């Protein structure tokens, strides 16, 4: 291998490369490695952790009160409570989720999400809610009896205080699902009990989430 | 998978500082010292401030040229003042000869010089967030065990040359291991080295008209 | 339902004064009235004990220190009370000022054993957003299901041993997400209690 001719691409500096270089301090023995607890080796394991969605993001509502969905008493049946698209990586309620931020450090992604809801009312307060999910094809349903014929989960928060709505698939390559919360029943309370509670939604990504083509963000 | 890992998330060497060897006009320095700083640009800062403790060695490349993109034969010296060595103070200074400060002698008209700085820190890993005071207001949260050194760059000359040399330091993070993930910074960066934000809070999520509109 | 932070019980660094159940007791700090207007509280990790009992003698009269903790929050709330807390332990919780003066006061970075009420809990007083605070070890306190939260925290730091009066490892934040509510004729201030129990503590460099 004594005679060589330089093929093209010489004297070039390609940033995204895994070349080698001489150590500027040979012999140096860096500080050894002790076991520090809590190492994360993948941003996927950070996405799969549930964080809050600013579902109440609205003009005027400031402070922590943007993370709360108001569920009150005099909201008649079949009325609409809240709705938010399933798009972790478009400006909306997902923009405050660990998934909604990491997905802005990449270009394409595809997987299954989940939206755990949590009721924060009195123990004596009972009722029922309808939580319906609409595939990307259709649009937001107009009535409660129009969303019951979908992929929903009726929620009796008096009995069970937290549910999960697993999104089947959400892929971003080139028109996104919608989740609506309908007042199934009324909001019934015994005497001497507050008549206005809150729902807290938490978003995440299931174990099938993937990311591709890392890129800078738009803050 | 394998593209969302922490080893790949910090790859793709980027510009960490544009230093300039001012040598003409009213700035007849002939040299310049650039304190090695990772959190120089907000884009890289916000990414590095995702973890608490991180351990990595770096490879530094210097893309130097004149101010009209021409690369003459002018010789350059890249001296790496280690963390705890006195820095030079003039074009002609004793520090430029100390054999403990490794130097790289390359010319403007040569492939950019590329060295590899090791993991230079007293503790086990770098600490971007250090709750506490060092030296057992202007000292809160300032860890001194994150200094990596200094890169002093001068044109090997005798008198003033009359040509400003712009250098673009490029750093690549290798062998990175991160610990204790943190929420990504939401507010702006009002000042460097501190987490100081501004009074007018900016909501993380954009505000729409009503809660029930898509 | 004890959230073992990062899945690591605090352990003794293999082979320093290793105290026992005399110091490994249950320090029950003062209670804090949780009101509707309440924003939150936070206590530093070893600073909350540097002036409380034996642990205040072993910390000040020494030079090196390492220990886990067993933070345990309870809310003596009624059944007609509603609300929700977010009890999270934040490793290397660094407080930030808020310029319209540039550096945090010392009372805000080492509040003592009383904690400092948040001035902007939406941003955790540290720039980072509260919505993502759940990435830290945490446990919800939802008055309709349970009013207890126990967090087991190991020793998280770069060096094996470190100072106890200068470097405060983490900070236990307690933030009400859903504010407290009640009809007329109830205890207008739900009390919040915090219990601490150093686990596998060590010390060195006497006096």
């Amino acid at each position, epitope marked *: 291998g004594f005679p060589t001719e330089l093929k093209p691409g010489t004297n070039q500096f390609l940033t995204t490369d895994d070349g080698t270089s001489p150590p500027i301090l040979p012999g140096f023995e860096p500080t050894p490695l002790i076991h520090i607890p809590g190492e994360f080796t993948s941003l996927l394991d950070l996405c799969q952790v549930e964080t809050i969605l600013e579902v109440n993001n*609205t*003009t*005027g*509502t400031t402070g922590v009160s943007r993370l709360l969905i108001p569920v009150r008493a005099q909201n008649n049946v079949d009325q609409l409570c809240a709705s938010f698209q399933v798009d972790p990586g478009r400006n909306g309620p997902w923009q405050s989720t660990m998934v909604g931020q990491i997905c802005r450090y990449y270009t394409q992604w595809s997987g299954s999400l989940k939206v755990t809801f949590m009721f924060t009312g009195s123990f004596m307060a009972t009722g029922k809610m309808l939580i319906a999910y609409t595939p990307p094809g259709s649009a937001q349903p107009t009535t409660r009896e129009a969303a019951m014929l979908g992929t929903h989960i009726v929620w009796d928060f008096g009995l069970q205080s937290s549910v999960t709505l697993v999104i089947p698939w959400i892929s971003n390559t080139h028109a996104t699902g919608i989740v609506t919360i309908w007042y199934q029943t009324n909001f019934v309370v015994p005497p001497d009990t507050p008549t*206005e509670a809150n729902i807290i939604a938490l978003g995440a990504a299931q174990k099938n989430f993937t990311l591709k083509l890392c890129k800078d963000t738009d803050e | 998978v394998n593209e969302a890992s922490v080893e790949h998330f910090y790859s793709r060497a980027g510009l960490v500082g544009v230093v300039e060897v001012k040598d003409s006009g009213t700035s007849l320095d002939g040299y310049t010292v650039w304190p090695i700083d990772v959190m120089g640009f907000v884009q890289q800062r916000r990414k590095l401030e995702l973890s608490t403790y991180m351990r990595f060695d770096a490879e530094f490349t210097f893309v130097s040229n004149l101010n009209n993109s021409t690369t003459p034969g002018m010789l350059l010296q890249y001296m790496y003042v280690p963390p705890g060595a006195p820095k030079p103070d003039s074009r002609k200074s004793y520090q430029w000869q100390t054999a403990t400060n490794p130097s790289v002698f390359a010319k403007l008209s040569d492939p950019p010089p590329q060295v590899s700085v090791p993991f230079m820190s007293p503790a086990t890993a770098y600490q971007w967030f250090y709750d506490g005071y060092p030296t057992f207001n202007l000292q809160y949260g300032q860890c001194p065990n994150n200094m990596m050194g200094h890169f002093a760059i001068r044109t090997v000359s005798e008198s003033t040359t009359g040509k400003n040399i712009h250098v673009r330091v490029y750093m690549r993070i290798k062998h990175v291991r991160a610990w204790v993930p943190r929420p990504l910074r939401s507010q702006a960066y009002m000042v460097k080295n501190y987490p100081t934000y501004s009074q007018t809070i900016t909501n993380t999520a954009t505000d729409r008209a009503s809660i029930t509109t898509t | 339902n004890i959230v073992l932070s990062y899945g690591e019980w605090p352990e003794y660094c293999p082979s320093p004064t290793r105290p026992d159940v005399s110091v490994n007791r249950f320090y029950t700090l003062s209670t804090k009235s949780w009101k*509707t207007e309440s924003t939150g509280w936070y206590w530093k990790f070893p600073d909350v004990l540097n002036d409380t009992g034996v642990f205040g003698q072993n910390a000040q009269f020494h030079y090196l220190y390492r220990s886990g903790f067993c933070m345990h929050v309870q809310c003596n709330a009624s059944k007609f009370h509603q609300g929700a807390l977010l009890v999270a332990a934040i490793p290397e919780f660094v407080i930030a000022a808020s310029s319209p003066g540039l550096y945090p006061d010392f009372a805000h970075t080492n509040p003592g054993k009383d904690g400092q009420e948040f001035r902007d809990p939406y941003v955790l007083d540290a720039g980072i957003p509260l919505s993502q605070a759940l990435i830290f070890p945490h446990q919800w306190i939802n008055l309709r299901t349970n009013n207890c939260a126990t967090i087991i925290m190991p020793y998280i730091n770069a060096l094996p041993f470190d100072s106890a009066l200068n470097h405060s490892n983490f900070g236990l934040v307690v933030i009400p997400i859903s504010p407290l509510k*009640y009809c007329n004729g109830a205890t207008t201030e739900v009390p919040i209690t915090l219990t601490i129990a150093p686990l596998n503590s060590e010390f060195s460099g006497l006096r």
Partner: antibody
Amino acid sequence: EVKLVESGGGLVKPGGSLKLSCAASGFAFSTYDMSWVRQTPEKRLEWVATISSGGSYTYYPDSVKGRFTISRDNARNTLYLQMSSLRSEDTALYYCARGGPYDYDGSFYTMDYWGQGTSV
Amino acid sequence: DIQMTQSPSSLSASLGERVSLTCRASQDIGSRLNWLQQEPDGTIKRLIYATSSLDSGVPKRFSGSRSGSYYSLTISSLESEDFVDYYCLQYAGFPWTFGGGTKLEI
């Protein structure tokens, strides 16, 4: 019912002090964030001052911003509002009602029930 | 302040007519605009909250609506006990300003 009643007003020389009471009952006056609204002689209701749900926070509009001093007894079920050195064009029927930018679970009772309004 | 103001300073309709009082906001105030009804001499009651929902006791003749920057209130058929003052209040702009008046006549 949310029974609020304002009282303690009347004439006063320009420059001095004249408090105002909004003692209310029939509802939990320990969780609601109240506020003060002024109805000038021109029949234009302008915001006067507010108070948090525990008497710790306060937003003062450009009307006083340093002159009026609101408070909250919260134990005798009363609401205070100072008129320190009131201006010349400051006569109004100072109403008091609920509603406040604090109390995160707000934006629902924003001046839901009102008082009666005492003149000055 | 956002300075949401009502256009009709004074209107007059019949006992079977359908009045339409507006309140044109300047900046983005969202769905945080209320309507406060004031007696000739008494206190000021509430009609609409969040621009759409009636209160717990208000009749069916009243109803709110939203249209861009033209938040408005429309009474069904203008029954008795209606020829009183009207106000529009928003709590988005932190100064919390008000409008003018819509004292109805006949």
